[PDB]
Design a protein around this nucleic acid. Structure first.
Length: 284
DNA sequence: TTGCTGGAAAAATAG
DNA sequence: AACTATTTTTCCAGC
């Protein structure tokens, strides 16, 4: 049986259920990196998959593979591979095999555990778009294609010769590291140019502007060179919520004969930095 | 050393 | 070719 085939959750007395859905969020790890864990449950544990209606007494194999996010087109995702985790914290044995270009990871579904299984041994590896897209015949695009689904399936051998094949897909999971949390970001400036002298006040409205927010003007080179840094004084004596009043600093060289492009950003901590804002100093 | 990550800087890209 | 604005990969540091 193919991985693309539209199997179903149930089939008469049989029914594959995802007792515990994974978290909506899970950062995948790259080859050039160390494992980033197994998919975790929103609670704190991990996902749980169970087969209902298996009165038989023989352990079955539960397959796991990462697939696309759209239900209508459950396909294994071309830019992600299930990753087999192992060792101490991993209460579930597991073997892996390749099927097509897909890594599939099998887990045991045991009658003694009521065909109930804990998926704490499956992590997610991220392939490089470039590498995948060079594969002849593939047309899926990687860029911005970071949602995926954990796809579970099992093959039920009926003593009557034929096998019932079931499958269940988890809720989508976001695999791209969400970078910000408590970051401050400018959305509206007030002034974007000024004379080398500065002294002019610039109003800045954005998000997450704390009582200890700072504004730093910087100048680079076309080769990304930090040739100028300079903190701007921010009227903290008073201010509206998410609105910072900045005093444009004087440009290092008041003798420039042509306008110079420069950047400024907002900082709340040694690592809490906004996106680089644009500014221009004009020769007097 | 294994994982295992959080946080990021460095490297790539789309327009 | 070079820019910016965004995304993706690689690195680094702390267990």
């Amino acid at each position: 049986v193919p991985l693309e085939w539209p199997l179903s959750s149930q089939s008469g007395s049989y029914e594959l259920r995802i007792e515990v859905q994974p978290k909506p969020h899970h950062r995948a790890h790259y080859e050039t990196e160390g494992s980033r864990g197994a998919v975790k449950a929103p609670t704190g544990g991990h996902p749980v998959v169970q087969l209902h209606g298996y009165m038989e007494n023989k352990p079955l194999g539960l397959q796991i593979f990462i697939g696309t996010a759209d239900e209508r087109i459950l396909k294994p995702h071309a830019f992600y591979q299930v990753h087999r985790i192992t060792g101490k914290t991993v209460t579930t044995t597991s073997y892996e095999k390749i099927v097509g270009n897909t890594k599939v990871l099998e887990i045991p579904l045991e009658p003694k555990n009521n065909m109930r299984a804990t998926i704490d041994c499956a992590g997610i590896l991220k392939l490089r778009n470039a590498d995948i897209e060079l594969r002849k015949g593939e047309t899926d695009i990687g860029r911005k294609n970071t949602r995926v689904r954990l796809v579970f399936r099992v093959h039920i051998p009926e003593s009557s010769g034929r096998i019932v094949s079931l499958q269940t897909a988890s809720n989508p999971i976001e695999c791209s590291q969400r970078s910000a949390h408590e970051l401050p970001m400018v959305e509206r400036q007030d002034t974007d140019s000024c004379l080398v002298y500065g002294g002019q006040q610039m109003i800045l409205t954005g998000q997450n502007f704390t009582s200890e927010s700072k504004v730093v003007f910087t100048e680079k080179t076309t080769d990304g060179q930090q040739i100028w840094e300079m903190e701007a004084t921010v009227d903290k004596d008073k201010s509206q919520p998410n609105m910072l009043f900045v005093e444009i600093p004087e440009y290092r060289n008041k003798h420039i004969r042509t306008p110079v492009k420069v950047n400024f950003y907002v900082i709340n901590g040694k690592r809490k930095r906004s996106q680089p804002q644009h500014f221009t100093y004009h020769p007097v």
